[PDB]
Amino acid sequence: AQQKLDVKWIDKGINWIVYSAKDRENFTMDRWAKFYVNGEIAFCIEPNKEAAIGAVHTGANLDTLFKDQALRNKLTMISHFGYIANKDQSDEQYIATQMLIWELLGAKYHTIYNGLNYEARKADILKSVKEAEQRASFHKQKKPIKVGEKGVFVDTNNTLSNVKGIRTPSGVNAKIEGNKLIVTADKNAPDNATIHLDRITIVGTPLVYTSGNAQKVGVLKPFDPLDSWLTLQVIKN
Ligand SMILES: [Zn+2]
Ligand SMILES: [Zn+2]
């Protein structure tokens, strides 16, 4: 509930950006706060304010700050694919992710340090977020399957390589091989057995952290596994 805001400073003697956001006009950022809250990577979500480093914040659900769910979704997508689940953990990626989050909350960049490689970093993030909307060709379908008999289901949308986890009820085995979902169900399987193919396996509730009038900080956890799913109608006979 009550959490201290920690930081790691990114300072290379470089003006990272010259930006404007709300009342804050033509502000030069010559260092960057990489925020942590209780071990977890956080982002500033009010680009016109300074954060209260070292102070006790109160955690509340992200919806207290932002009503619009599509925005809340997008902010968690950018956090997730941009940095937390990204292969590149560099200071530059963190900054790019923070900067992209800030673009959605009204920040405008007049100057950007060329060494960020910002446009290329941003583009790869938006591609990852857009691809996460795509679902398998068998998404939401019901398919009959006899107990014992191994079934194969082809995803003609070419999305199964993005699957990070598989949930199945007891008595159902489900594996991925290329664009094929390989399935077998036994007598312990329920009559309608749903397989979930998750894109995200570190799902949680996104929190906003507030200390006084200082900058609000988000632990922007994705709250949806973004699964393609398929329901098997298990034939007992
Ligand atoms: Zn320094
Ligand atoms: Zn400074």
Author numbering: 4 to 240
Paste lines from the article.
An increasing number of surface‐associated proteins identified in Gram‐positive bacteria are characterized by intramolecular cross‐links in structurally conserved thioester, isopeptide, and ester domains (TIE proteins). TEDs are predicted at the distal end of a large number of surface proteins from Gram‐positive bacteria, and the name TIE (thioester, isopeptide, ester) proteins have been introduced for this family. Internal thioester bonds, formed between Cys and Gln side‐chains and first identified in the second thioester domain (TED) of the Streptococcus pyogenes minor pilin Cpa,3 play a negligible role in protein stability, but are suggested to mediate covalent bacterial adhesion. Structures of Bacillus anthracis, vancomycin‐resistant Staphylococcus aureus, and vancomycin‐resistant Enterococcus faecium TEDs show a head domain with Class I topology extended by a β‐sandwich; the latter contributes the thioester bond‐forming Gln via a β‐hairpin insertion into the head domain.
The B. anthracis BaTIE and the 86 kDa E. faecium EfmTIE86 proteins are predicted to comprise a Class II TED as well as three and five CnaB‐type isopeptide domains (IPDs), respectively. In addition to a TED and four IPDs, the S. aureus SaTIE protein is predicted to also contain two ester domains [Fig. 1(A)]. SaTIE is the only TIE protein so far identified in S. aureus. SaTIE‐TED (Gln254‐Gly502) and EfmTIE86‐TED (Asp39‐Ala314) were determined by ESI‐MS to be 17 Da lighter than predicted (suggesting the presence of a thioester bond), and readily yielded high‐quality crystals. SaTIE‐TED and EfmTIE86‐TED crystal structures were determined using Se‐SAD phasing and standard refinement procedures. Continuous electron density between Cys and Gln side‐chains either previously shown or predicted to form thioesters (SaTIE‐TED: Cys296 + Gln467,5 EfmTIE86‐TED: Cys88 + Gln292) confirmed the presence of these bonds. Despite pairwise identities of 18–23%, all three Class II TEDs in this study display very similar tertiary structures. In Class II TEDs, this loop is extended by approximately 15 residues, and covers the cleft between the β‐barrel and α‐helical subdomains. The specificity loop also contributes to forming a pore over 8 Å deep, the second restriction on access to the thioester bond [Fig. 5(C)]. The depth of this pore is longer than, for example, a Lys side‐chain (7 Å), strongly suggesting that in order for the thioester to interact with its cognate receptor, the surrounding tertiary structure must undergo a conformational change.
